From a paper:
ATP13A2, which is mutated in juvenile-onset Parkinson’s disease and autosomal recessive spastic paraplegia 78, is a transporter with a critical role in balancing the polyamine concentration between the lysosome and the cytosol. The overall structure of hATP13A2 has a canonical P-type ATPase architecture, with the cytosolic A domain linking to TM1 and TM2 domains, and the N and P domains sitting on the TM4 and TM5. The P-type ATPases transport substrates by coupling ATP hydrolysis with protein phosphorylation states and adopting a series of intermediate states, consisting of E1, E1-ATP, E1P-ADP, E1P, E2P, E2-Pi, and E2, in a process known as the Post-Albers reaction. Here, we report seven cryo-EM structures of hATP13A2 in six intermediate states, importantly including the putative E2 and E1-like states, thereby providing a nearly complete atomic-level conformational cycle spanning the Post-Albers reaction process.
Adenine nucleotides (AMP-PCP or ADP) or phosphate analogs (BeF3− or AlF4−) were used to stabilize hATP13A2 in the E1-ATP or E1P/E2P intermediate states. However, in the structures obtained after incubation with BeF3− and AlF4−, no significant difference was observed. By comparing with known E2P structures, we suggest that both BeF3− and AlF4− incubated structures are in the same E2P state. Accordingly, we found a polyamine entrance binding pocket positioned in the endo-/lysosomal luminal leaflet with an outward-opening architecture in the E2P structure of hATP13A2. Spatially, the entrance site (denoted as Site1) located among TM1, TM2, TM4a, TM5, and TM6, had a chalk-shaped architecture open to the luminal side where substrates were captured. The chalk-shaped EM density, in conjunction with the results of a liquid chromatography-tandem mass spectrometry (LC-MS/MS) experiment, suggested the presence of a linear endogenous spermine (SPM) substrate. The gating feature of Site1 was further supported by all-atom explicit solvent MD simulations of hATP13A2 in the E2P state, which revealed that, despite being deeply buried in the membrane bilayer, Site1 could be hydrated. In E2P state, conformational rearrangements in the cytosolic domains and transmembrane regions induce the opening of the entrance pocket Site1, and the negatively charged amino acids are enabled to recruit positively charged polyamines (shown in green). The low pH environment of the lysosome may favor the recruitment of polyamines from the luminal side to the negatively charged entrance Site1 in the E2P state.
Author numbering: 36 to 107, 163 to 416, 420 to 560, 572 to 585, 611 to 790, 820 to 1169
Write the structure that this text describes.
């Protein structure tokens, strides 16, 4: 979208120093609204002529950053892209002027190289072509990524807690908080360091010069417009260059997955110089391995570099990764608003209570601050981390070496997973199916089967045909051959010599000679068309075009073979004289070679299990459409009235054609690029039912992932390595199943190449999310009940014992908050998903329901003691209010502890998708021990309340009533928690519509209305 620029470098060196010195404290409110902050300090409004400080306007692009330029030609760095200053009309553009030179192609064709006349300025403007992530902020993570406000509030509460004694509690909470924040810095920095090491290329590449000068220069000094020479052996390509002469052969192993070599461009011209937007074969991609290059009539092969930098395929992924994105983070505003609106009256209420008792003005405010800080606890991230560590440790047991505590629960409610077919949907390496290289005319279907089981010259012909596919062909047949071969058992054969590949014509002729029993002959292979048209006098083509179309329609690779018997003397003469034209012209059709692209047998059960839980399975790959549809039919997950489409980028007006094979559609790269613009009127109608995404460039994968995230979807794209690097961070779940190459950084990293891990990782994420939600609910309820307990304790104007409270808090943190998250998911596959977004009726129908019960059970116990002959504690007369061990405080503390115990016991729920309740034996024994010690703290008259100062009372009849009340509460809490499991009233009221959002459901229901 459009963006405006403005200039305001400086006015004068005046009050700016004082402003900078003053603004050191209020930076917390200064950071928000940068535009107002920079406009309130200085504003030298003028035209952009020599302005260093620029501000991005908020006219259409609703964001803001900071920019700093350097004077060397005015330029700066902004998300990798560099802007070029032009004085012709005083405006800023990108590096697209010289590249888009669609005029006077003669000078482009005459580019042969430069030495020293046009290098300094080019190096000054373009600069280094290397890719490096800066590590400037090595200290500065504290000031960069720690400007959230669970840390400012934590620091504010630290001083308030340090005002009192609070030794052990503060010592524990600071030690806990300083470890996670220190480990996060190392975790963040290791990713950047390994990315910097992985993205590096420093090698010496020769550059030809006019006049006959050759020397070795580094790859750092490389600018567009120069000529690069290609060595015969072939190395790596550091920049996106283009061939100008000769013929070369390369494979797009890291660009499209398949290692299928493709012919290069041609010498004839007539169009523009490069035309990268309208040319695909002519464009030579970089970052790929070169197998072999062919020379020409010239002295050597030369290449021309027309564009390099972050705009190429290598830099596109890097730019996509370091770009900011447009749950688990929007659910805190409601909670903080609720606590604020619940505690606004609490402060004034407590002030009113304190004002009645004539509280001194010394500790009047510390009590209010403690009350404010007690209804919100600084341990929620700690609880989340300690709940997550168990799942993280269990995940690593199955060979999954991933570190992402905050990403485990994100992918719990996965809706669809984007698969890829290069190594994760098909067995690595090309295997041999039933091959039957029969004769030509008078053919019969006979008979696809494992090779070399029958006997005959075909076995020897296939064995002698050779040059990662040759090794597999030799090994996967059973008969081991490279100079001599036995276990025929009869009529042994051996090879003597072979001929190299010829790039001009696809021919592979191998000469064999066995003078023992049979006669020597020659075997050749090549394209089926060549052997069909070159064998007319011997094998006339009869009914040959009917099977070729069917074989090619399935994406199978077909290569034919041929042979011609010859006498011994000419055969040996041809073998020794290194000739090839003496055997061509008249041969006999040997047959054809057929390959198979079948998927792994274990993938089908996983696909079937994934399709019965209303989870979509989309296919994303860069192969041809025929291979994609063949793989889809082979998997057989679904195919109701499959429809095929073809690009129509020929006229401004266009229409989608209708062709034959609750429906699915196939989309391609150019098809997706043409259907967009307009996006909102053509993409939503096809992005829901489409399931085929073949023949798409890797750069479009990032755009597709970004667009899918805006539709409230849950992407589950899994990478393989060196194929999809940019589409790994903006997605929800990213799993790498190979050590090379994108496995250095990923949301999930595993050492397994099977799809069976997806269901178990999904179940683990769901269980972790459920445990985290339960823990958060328990902590919120405990905070609320502590708040009301403290509020009701202000009637007598007393304070709880610091030692007992500290001990009980430590016990709760080390016993309940730890062993609670030990539950795991069962070995079953559920239908529904754990529902988050705790702002609905079924989730909010328990908070107040438990709160009213707690308030009633506290009020009854507090008001029941009025019928007992006890003396009034010293509270209104002269006494020490710091410590008052009276009966009321003791009974209130006992009731609060019992409430904590019952909440910790009855916090559990159902959801049988996880492990059953009677499984966590350590949790059960810990609860039993807690109950036993709680009973013994007040039952036995033994010496235990000495340092506790509990004021033990010789009570005889009140203990029975207390036990009856606690048993009634125990039998009531379970009933309250179990009667609300059903949601029949929820569906009795919400009909027919139930959701006020998620427009995808509305689209689905309006689409199924007419079908
Ligand atoms: F088939 Be791939 F690796 F996109
Ligand atoms: Mg792959």
């Amino acid at each position: 979208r459009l963006s405006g620029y403005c200039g305001s470098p400086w006015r004068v060196i005046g009050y700016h120093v004082v402003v900078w010195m003053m603004a050191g404290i209020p930076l917390l409110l200064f950071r928000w609204k940068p535009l107002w902050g920079v406009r309130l300090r200085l504003r030298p409004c003028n035209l952009a002529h020599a302005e260093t400080l620029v501000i991005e306007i908020r006219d259409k692009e609703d964001s803001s950053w900071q920019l700093f330029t350097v004077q060397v030609l005015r330029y700066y760095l902004f998300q990798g892209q560099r802007y070029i200053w032009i004085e012709t009309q005083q405006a800023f553009y990108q590096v697209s002027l010289l590249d888009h030179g669609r005029s006077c192609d003669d000078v482009h064709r005459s580019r042969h190289g430069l030495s020293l006349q046009d290098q300094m300025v080019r190096k000054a403007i373009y600069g280094p072509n290397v890719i490096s992530i800066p590590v400037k902020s090595y200290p500065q993570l504290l000031v960069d990524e720690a400007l959230n406000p669970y840390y400012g509030f934590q620091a504010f509460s630290i001083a308030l807690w340090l005002a009192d004694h609070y030794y052990w509690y503060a010592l524990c909470i600071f030690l806990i908080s300083s470890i996670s924040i220190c480990l996060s810095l190392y975790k963040t920095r290791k990713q950047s360091q390994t990315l910097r090491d992985m993205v590096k290329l420093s090698m010496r590449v020769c550059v030809c010069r006019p006049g006959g000068e050759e020397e070795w220069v580094d790859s750092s000094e490389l600018v567009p417009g120069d000529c690069l020479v290609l060595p015969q052996e072939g190395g790596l390509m550091p920049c996106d260059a283009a061939l100008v002469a000769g013929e070369c052969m390369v494979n797009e192993s890291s660009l499209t997955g398949e290692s299928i070599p493709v012919l290069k461009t041609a010498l004839p011209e007539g169009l523009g110089p490069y035309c990268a937007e309208t040319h695909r074969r002519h464009t030579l991609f970089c970052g790929t391995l070169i197998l072999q290059a062919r020379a020409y009539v010239g002295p050597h092969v030369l290449a021309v570099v027309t564009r390099t930098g972050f705009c190429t395929a290598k830099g596109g992924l890097v730019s996509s990764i370091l770009h900011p994105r447009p749950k688990f983070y929007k659910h805190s505003m409601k909670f903080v608003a609720a606590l604020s609106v619940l505690a606004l009256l609490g402060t004034i209420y407590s002030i009113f209570i304190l004002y009645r008792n004539r509280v001194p003005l010394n500790e009047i405010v510390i009590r209010a601050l403690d009350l404010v800080t007690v209804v919100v606890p600084p341990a929620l991230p700690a609880a989340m981390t300690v709940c997550t560590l168990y799942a993280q440790s269990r995940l690593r047991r199955q060979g999954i070496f991933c570190i992402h505590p905050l990403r485990i629960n994100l992918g719990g409610k996965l809706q669809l997973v984007c698969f890829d077919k290069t190594g994760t949907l098909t067995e690595d390496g090309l295997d041999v199916m039933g091959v039957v290289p029969l004769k030509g005319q008078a053919f019969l279907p006979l008979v696809p089967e494992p090779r070399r089981l029958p006997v005959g010259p075909l076995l020897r012909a296939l064995a002698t045909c050779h040059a990662p596919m040759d090794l597999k062909m030799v090994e996967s047949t059973g008969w081991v051959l490279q100079l001599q071969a036995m276990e025929e058992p009869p009529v042994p054969v051996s090879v003597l010599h072979r001929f190299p590949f010829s790039s001009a014509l696809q021919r592979m002729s191998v000469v064999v000679a066995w003078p023992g029993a049979t006669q020597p002959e020659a075997y050749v292979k090549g394209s089926p068309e060549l052997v069909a048209g070159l064998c007319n006098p011997e094998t006339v083509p009869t009914d040959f075009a009917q099977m070729l179309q069917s074989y090619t329609a399935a994406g199978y690779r077909v290569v034919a073979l041929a042979s011609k018997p010859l006498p011994t003397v000419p055969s040996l003469e041809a073998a020794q004289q290194l000739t090839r034209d003496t055997v061509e012209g008249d041969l006999s059709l040997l047959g054809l070679l057929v390959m198979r692209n079948l998927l792994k047998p274990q993938t089908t059960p996983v696909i079937q299990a994934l399709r019965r839980t209303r989870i979509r399975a989309v296919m994303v790959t860069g192969d041809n459409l025929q291979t994609a549809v063949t793989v889809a039919r082979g998997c057989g997950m679904v195919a109701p009235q499959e429809h095929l489409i073809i690009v129509h980028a020929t006229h401004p007006e266009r229409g989608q054609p209708a062709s034959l094979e609750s429906r699915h559609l196939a989309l391609s790269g150019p098809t997706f690029g043409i259907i967009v613009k307009h996006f909102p009127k053509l993409l939503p109608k096809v992005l829901v039912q489409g399931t085929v995404f073949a023949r798409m460039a890797p750069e479009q994968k990032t755009e597709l992932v970004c667009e899918l995230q805006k539709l409230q979807y849950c992407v589950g794209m899994c990478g393989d390595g060196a194929n999809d690097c940019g589409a790994l961070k903006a997605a929800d779940v990213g799993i790498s199943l190979s050590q090379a190459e994108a496995s250095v950084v990923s949301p999930f990293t595993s050492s397994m190449a099977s799809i069976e891990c997806v269901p178990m990782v999904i179940r683990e994420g769901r269980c972790s999310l459920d445990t985290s939600f339960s823990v958060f609910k328990y902590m919120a309820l405990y905070s609320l009940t502590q708040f009301i307990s403290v509020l009701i304790l202000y009637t007598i104007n007393t304070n709880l014992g610091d030692l007992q409270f500290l001990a009980i808090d430590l016990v709760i943190t080390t016993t309940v908050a730890v062993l609670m998250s030990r539950t795991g998911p069962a070995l079953v596959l559920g239908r529904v998903r754990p529902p988050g977004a705790l702002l609905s009726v079924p989730v909010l129908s328990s908070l107040l329901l438990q709160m009213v019960l707690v308030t009633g059970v506290q009020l009854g116990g507090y008001f029941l003691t009025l019928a007992q002959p006890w003396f009034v504690p010293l509270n209104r007369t002269v006494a020490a209010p710091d410590n008052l061990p009276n009966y009321e405080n003791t009974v209130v503390f006992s009731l609060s502890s019992f409430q904590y115990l019952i909440l910790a016991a009855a916090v559990s729920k159902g959801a049988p998708f996880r492990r059953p309740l009677y499984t966590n034996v350590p949790f059960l024994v810990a609860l039993a021990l807690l109950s036993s010690v709680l009973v013994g703290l007040v039952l036995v008259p033994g010496l235990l309340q000495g340092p506790l100062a509990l004021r033990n009372i010789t009570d005889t009849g009140f203990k029975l009533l207390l036990l009856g009340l606690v048993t009634l509460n125990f039998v009531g809490a379970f009933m309250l928690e179990s009667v609300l499991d059903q949601c029949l009233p929820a569906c009795l009221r919400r009909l027919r519509p139930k959701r006020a959002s998620k427009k995808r459901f509305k689209q689905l229901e309006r689409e199924l209305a007419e079908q």
